[PDB]
C-alpha cells in the first residue's frame, strides 16, 4: 500500500535478477504477431480449442494478475489497445528453461513479458495463449494508478502514457486527431494543393494580432520571433506561383492558457489561387460535412457542451449552415445603429455605452477593433449551438488582411466558423492590392512580394485541437494535445 | 530601364485606372479550366485547328511581351509550372467591352489576367488561347528579372517564377515527405505532435533555443530533438510512432547545418539494431526508385564546376565498426575506457599529428567524432553506408552493445560525407541511464519501456542529395539569411 517501499524493492528484484544471471531488460525478443493480429487469426476459435502446435512469439503488458492455485496463473495481456488472456498451465510449461511457480511469482502488474506458448480458448470462451515460457523484457517499477485516481487529477497531462496505458478513451481520442489530420490533408491533396513548410522563427511576427514569443539566435545575433500564423509567407508563396499551397503546423501566441487556448497551437492554413470567399464557404460546408460523415457515418454528433455532469446537445453538421453578418446582427440585437467609419469617434464611443449599459468588459485599449470583437463575443457568438455557423461580412478594421467587400462599404469578405460558441476556422478574400495594405507604409518583405501581383486569393485557417475537441467530446483543449505545456510542480 | 522609374510608372498607371473608374484588382475571375489541363486537352490538335465553338475562361501570368503590327499580339502566359500562347488577334476581339489597342498596350511582363478566348493552334503548331477578352487582374509593378544570387533566398517568389527548377526542387521536397509518412504508415506507424517547447531540451548534444512563456513565467526551451516524449509514448503502448516536424539547435549556419530543420524520428518497439538497418535499407532504396526509378543518381559533390558521382542505393549498404576503423586507419589501438587519461593523450596525438583541427573541450567524445570525421566519414561516396557501434561514451541513451563491451548498438548512415540518419536500440534499464540516478522521461522508464528501435532522419539533407544541391538553404523555401 505503500508506493515508495513498492518501487524500493521492485529495484532489489531487478539487482537480484540480474546478479543471478538473468537480463532483466533482453535486447532483442523476436515477436511473431501482434495482439490485434491474434485476436483477428483465432476470434473463431471454438470453445476449449487448442491450437497445441501452433507455437507463437508474442509480448504486452501484464495488466491484470491472478492465480487458480500454484499451478495455473492467469493475466491479462495488453497490446495496442487491445487484451487477451494468458493461461499459464504447469502442464504445458518448459521446466527445462526453470521452475513453474519461480517463473511466475515474479510477475507484476505492468511488467512487460514476452511469451511462447500457443493460442487457445478456454472452457469459458476466453481468447487466450498458453505459454510454454513467459520472460520478462522490461519490468513496471511503480504500482500502476486505478482509472479513479486519474479521474480528476492532473496524472492524465503530467505523465501522458499512464493515461493511454489505463483509460481505453484515451487512446480512441488521440487516434480520432490523427485520422482528422489524415482526413485534412488528403482532402486538400486530392484537390492539387501542395504542403509546404515555412520558417518558424522570423524578423517579425504578423498574420494575426497575437503577443509573441522571443528568442535569440546566436550564430546571427538577432532576436527572432516565432510565428503567429503561416499567413504571410504562404501568401508569398502564391505570388510564386504555388496556385494551391498550405501548411499544417505549430503557431505559438504567448499569451494566456485556458479551455480553449494553448499557446502553442495546431494550424492549417491554405491559400486558393482564383477563389474567393464564396469558394471558402462552400469549402467549410463540404469539409466539415465530409469529415463528420467519415469519422461517424453521420452528419450529427453529440457534444457536452456543459461538460460530462450534463446533458449533452446535438450538433447537426449537414449543410449549408447559416451565415450572420457581423455589423448588422450587432446593430438589431443591441437596437444600435453602428455608424461609418466604426474607429470615428462617435461610432467608438457609442459601442462603450453599449458596453457600459450592458456591463460588459471594456476591453483596454477601447479601439474600434476591439470594441467590435468584444460585441460579437457577447451579443452574437453563441446564436447558434445545433450547429456550425458562419459570422462574415467584418469590418476592414477588424481584418487588416482582408479585402473590401464588392458592395458593402466599409466590410471585407471575411468568414469565421463558429462550434458551440467557439471559433474554429478563419477564412477571406485576399486583399492583393498593395496600395490599400495601409501598412505597407508588418513585414516590408510581404508587402514587397504584393507588389509583384499577388492573384485574386482566398485562404483560410483551420483549428485543429478545437475540431479536435468537438470530433471526441473534449471540453478542454488539454485533452487533445499528448504533452499539455503544465506548470511545472 | 531603372527598377524604381519602372515601379513609379507602374503605381501612377494603377491609380490613373482607378481614377477612371476600372478596378485593376478586381475581386473574383471565374476560371473555367487551368493552363496544364488546356494543354492536356488541346494538345493533340492540328495545326491551324481553332475550336471557336468553346469559349473558356482561363487566368494566368504573363511572361513575354511582342506584337506583328498593331494588330496581332503575342504572350506567354504560365501557371502551374506550365505555359501556354497568348494570341490576341483584332478580328476575334470583343470590341463592345474596349479599344483592342488599348486594352493590350497596357500588359506587362508579370501581369495576372483573366482571359475569355477559345483554344486553337497557330499556323506553326504553337496551342494558343485566342482572346475575345482579357482582363488585368493583378499587375506585377516591379520589372521581373531573367537571370539573377542572394534573390533566390530573400525573394523566394521570384525564384520559383523565374527558374523551373527551383519549382522542382520544392516539389521533390514535398514528394520526399509525402513517401517518407505514406511509408511509415503502411507499416502500421502512428503519427503524433509533441511540445516544440520544454522545461529542457534532450535528445541530442546542441545549444538551444530560449524563449519566455508569459503565463508561466517561465523561460523554456525549442526542442533539439523529438526522442524523449516519443519514448515516453512507446511506454504508453504506441508501439509505433513517429512525428515530422521542426526541432532547433542554436548553433552556427553552414551549407549543411540549418539551426531550425526538418527532423523524423520514429519509434519501434521490439525492434533491434537490425530490424533499423533493414528498414533504412528498405526506406532509402525505394525512396531513390520511387522518385527516379533507377537505384543510381548523380550527384555533384564537389559543385557543378567539377564533375558529378555517382550514387548507388541498391541495398545491402557497407557497415563500418567506428573505433576499429578508426584503429586500422590510423594504425593506433584506443584501449578502454576511452576517457582514460593515456586514450585522450593518444587521440589528442593523432589529431596534432595530422595537423587536425583539435575540438575544445578535448573530450573523448568530441576527439572520436573528429577522428571519425577525418578518417572514415568519406570511406564511401560511391554508395551510403553505415557507421555503427559508437562508444557508450558518445551514445548515453543506445543500449548496450550485446557482445562488445563499452560499445553500442547504434547506426549512422552517411552519404558524400554527410549524416543523414542515427538510429540505435534504445537504452531502456533505467538504471544503466547514468543522468537518472529529463526527470520525467527517467520516470517513464520505471514504468517499464519494451525493447525498442529509434531512429531519426535528416530530411533537408536528403532532399539536398536526391536534388542535386550543395546547400540546405537550396532545399529550404525561406532559409533564415542575415538583415540588412
Ligand atoms: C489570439 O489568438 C490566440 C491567442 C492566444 C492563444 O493561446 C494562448 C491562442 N491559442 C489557440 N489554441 C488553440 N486554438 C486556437 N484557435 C483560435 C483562437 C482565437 C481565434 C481563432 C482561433 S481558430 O481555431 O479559429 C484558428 C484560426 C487559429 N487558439 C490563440
Ligand atoms: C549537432 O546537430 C546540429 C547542430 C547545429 C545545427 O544547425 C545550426 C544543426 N542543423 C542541421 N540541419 C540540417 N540537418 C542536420 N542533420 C544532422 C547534423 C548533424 C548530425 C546528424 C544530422 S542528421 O541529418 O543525420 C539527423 C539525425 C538530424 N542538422 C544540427
Ligand atoms: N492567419 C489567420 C488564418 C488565415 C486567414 C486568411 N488569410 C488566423 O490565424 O486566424
Ligand atoms: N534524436 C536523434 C535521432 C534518434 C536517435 C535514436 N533514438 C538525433 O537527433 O540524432
Not at 513498492?6 to 535486447?27: A, L, V
Not at 483465432?42 to 507463437?56: A, F, R
Not at 466539415?288 to 457515418?297: E, R, T
Request: glycine letters at 6%.
Amino acid at each position: 500500500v505503500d508506493p515508495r517501499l513498492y518501487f524500493e524493492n521492485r529495484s532489489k528484484f531487478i539487482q537480484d535478477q540480474k546478479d543471478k544471471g538473468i537480463n532483466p531488460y533482453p535486447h532483442k525478443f523476436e515477436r511473431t504477431i501482434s495482439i490485434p493480429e491474434f485476436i483477428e487469426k483465432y476470434k473463431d476459435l471454438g470453445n476449449g480449442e487448442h491450437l497445441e502446435d501452433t507455437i507463437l512469439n508474442i509480448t504486452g503488458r501484464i495488466m491484470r494478475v491472478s492465480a487458480s492455485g500454484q499451478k495455473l496463473r492467469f493475466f491479462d495481456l495488453v497490446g495496442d489497445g487491445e487484451k487477451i488472456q494468458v493461461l499459464a498451465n504447469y502442464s504445458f510449461h518448459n521446466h527445462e528453461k526453470g521452475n513453474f511457480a519461480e517463473c511466475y511469482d515474479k510477475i507484476r502488474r505492468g511488467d512487460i513479458v514476452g511469451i511462447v506458448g500457443f493460442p487457445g480458448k478456454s472452457k469459458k470462451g476466453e481468447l487466450s495463449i498458453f505459454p510454454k515460457e513467459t520472460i520478462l523484457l522490461s519490468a513496471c517499477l511503480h504500482m500502476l494508478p486505478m482509472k479513479y485516481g486519474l479521474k480528476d487529477t492532473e496524472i492524465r497531462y503530467r505523465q501522458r502514457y499512464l493515461d493511454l496505458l489505463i483509460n481505453e478513451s484515451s487512446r480512441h481520442t488521440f487516434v480520432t486527431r490523427t485520422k482528422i489530420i489524415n482526413f485534412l490533408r488528403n482532402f486538400l491533396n486530392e484537390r492539387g494543393f501542395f504542403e509546404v513548410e515555412t520558417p518558424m522563427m522570423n524578423l517579425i511576427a504578423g498574420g494575426a494580432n497575437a503577443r509573441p514569443f522571443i528568442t535569440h539566435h546566436n550564430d546571427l545575433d538577432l532576436d527572432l520571433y516565432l510565428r503567429i500564423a503561416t499567413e504571410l509567407p504562404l501568401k508569398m508563396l502564391i505570388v510564386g506561383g504555388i496556385d494551391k499551397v498550405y501548411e499544417i503546423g505549430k503557431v505559438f501566441r504567448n499569451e494566456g492558457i485556458d479551455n480553449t487556448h494553448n499557446p502553442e497551437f495546431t494550424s492549417c492554413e491554405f491559400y486558393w489561387a482564383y477563389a474567393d470567399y464564396n469558394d471558402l464557404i462552400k469549402w467549410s460546408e463540404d469539409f466539415f460535412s465530409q469529415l463528420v460523415y467519415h469519422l461517424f457515418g453521420t452528419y450529427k454528433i453529440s457534444y457536452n457542451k456543459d461538460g460530462p455532469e450534463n446533458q449533452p446537445i446535438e450538433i447537426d453538421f449537414t449543410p449549408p449552415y447559416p451565415k450572420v453578418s457581423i455589423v448588422e446582427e450587432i446593430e438589431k440585437v443591441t437596437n444600435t445603429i453602428l455608424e461609418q467609419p466604426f474607429d470615428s469617434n462617435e461610432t467608438i464611443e457609442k459601442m462603450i455605452n453599449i458596453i457600459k449599459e450592458h456591463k460588459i468588459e471594456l476591453p483596454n485599449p477601447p479601439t474600434a477593433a476591439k470594441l467590435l470583437d468584444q460585441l460579437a463575443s457577447h451579443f452574437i457568438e453563441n446564436k447558434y449551438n445545433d450547429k456550425p455557423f458562419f459570422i462574415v461580412e467584418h469590418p476592414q478594421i477588424m481584418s487588416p488582411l482582408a479585402k473590401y467587400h464588392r458592395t458593402k462599404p466599409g466590410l471585407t469578405e471575411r468568414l469565421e466558423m463558429f462550434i458551440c460558441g467557439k471559433e474554429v476556422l478563419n477564412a477571406y478574400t485576399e486583399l492583393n492590392d498593395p496600395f490599400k495594405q495601409k501598412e505597407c507604409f508588418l513585414d516590408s518583405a510581404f508587402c514587397t512580394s504584393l507588389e509583384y501581383g499577388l492573384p485574386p486569393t482566398g485562404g483560410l485557417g483551420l483549428g485543429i485541437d478545437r475540431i479536435t475537441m468537438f470530433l471526441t467530446n473534449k471540453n478542454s483543449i488539454k485533452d487533445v494535445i499528448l504533452f499539455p505545456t503544465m506548470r511545472p510542480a
